[PDB]
Amino acid sequence: ASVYAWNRKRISNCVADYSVLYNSASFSTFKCYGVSPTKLNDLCFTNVYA
Amino acid sequence: SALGKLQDVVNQNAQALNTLVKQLSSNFGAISSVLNDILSRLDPPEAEV
Amino acid sequence: DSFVIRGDEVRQIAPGQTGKIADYNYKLPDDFTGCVIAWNSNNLDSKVG
């Protein structure tokens, strides 16, 4: 998208692996507020918006 | 109500315990009142605050 | 301790910070008493090739 109209995907009914996000060597900024990336795998979330 | 003098003490203590237990449901500024979720989401450098 | 980090990563070599450098290369203790002295060594440790 563009910032004025920000695209949103509602991700649901799935098993999500977050190791791929953390193990990635490319992201410039991976700032997590309220949760920490390494411990994200442990929990299950009702809904995730992207 | 004839035994109110004892019941109020029981009620005050029950209330005192009920208030104390209810304080565990308060965040006090934290992201969550339940300790296990904070430790499950955050790492020590963030969890400690 | 002496080492040559990348510029973006300089923030990581600080107490309680995360990243590749901080997690798997050098970790500063969360209670660090110290000084992180850094300079722009881009003209000594970088070669054309």
Curated annotation (Swiss-Prot), chain A:
Variant or mutagenesis effect after changing residue 28 to F: In strain: Omicron/BA.1, Omicron/BA.2, Omicron/BA.2.12.1, Omicron/BA.2.75, Omicron/BA.4, Omicron/BA.5, Omicron/BQ.1.1, Omicron/XBB.1.5, Omicron/EG.5.1
Effect upon mutating residue 24 to F: In strain: Omicron/BA.2, Omicron/BA.2.12.1, Omicron/BA.2.75, Omicron/BA.4, Omicron/BA.5, Omicron/BQ.1.1, Omicron/XBB.1.5, Omicron/EG.5.1
Top-level taxon: Viruses
Function: Attaches the virion to the cell membrane by interacting with host receptor, initiating the infection. The major receptor is host ACE2. When S2/S2' has been cleaved, binding to the receptor triggers direct fusion at the cell membrane. When S2/S2' has not been cleaved, binding to the receptor results in internalization of the virus by endocytosis using host TFRC and GRM2 and leading to fusion of the virion membrane with the host endosomal membrane. Alternatively, may use NRP1/NRP2 and integrin as entry receptors.
Subunit structure comment from the entry: Binds to host ACE2. RBD also interacts with the N-linked glycan on 'Asn-90' of ACE2. Cleavage of S generates a polybasic C-terminal sequence on S1 that binds to host Neuropilin-1 (NRP1) and Neuropilin-2 (NRP2) receptors. Interacts with host integrin alpha-5/beta-1 (ITGA5:ITGB1) and with ACE2 in complex with integrin alpha-5/beta-1 (ITGA5:ITGB1). May interact via cytoplasmic c-terminus with M protein. May interact (via N-terminus) with host bilirubin and biliverdin, thereby preventing antibody binding to the SARS-CoV-2 spike NTD via an allosteric mechanism.
UniProt name for this protein: Spike protein S1
Gene name linked to the record: S
UniProtKB/Swiss-Prot annotation, chain B:
Superkingdom of origin: Viruses
Effect ascribed to mutating residue 39 to F: In strain: Omicron/BA.1
Coiled-coil features, chain-numbered ranges: 7-49
Task of the protein: Subunit of the fusion protein that is processed upon entry into the host cell. Mediates fusion of the virion and cellular membranes by functioning as a class I viral fusion protein. Contains a viral fusion peptide that is unmasked after S2 cleavage. This cleavage can occur at the cell membrane by host TMPRSS2 or during endocytosis by host CSTL. In either case, this triggers an extensive and irreversible conformational change that leads to fusion of the viral envelope with the cellular cytoplasmic membrane, releasing viral genomic RNA into the host cell cytoplasm.
Protein name: Spike protein S2'
Organism taxonomic ancestry: Viruses, Riboviria, Orthornavirae, Pisuviricota, Pisoniviricetes
Name of encoding gene: S
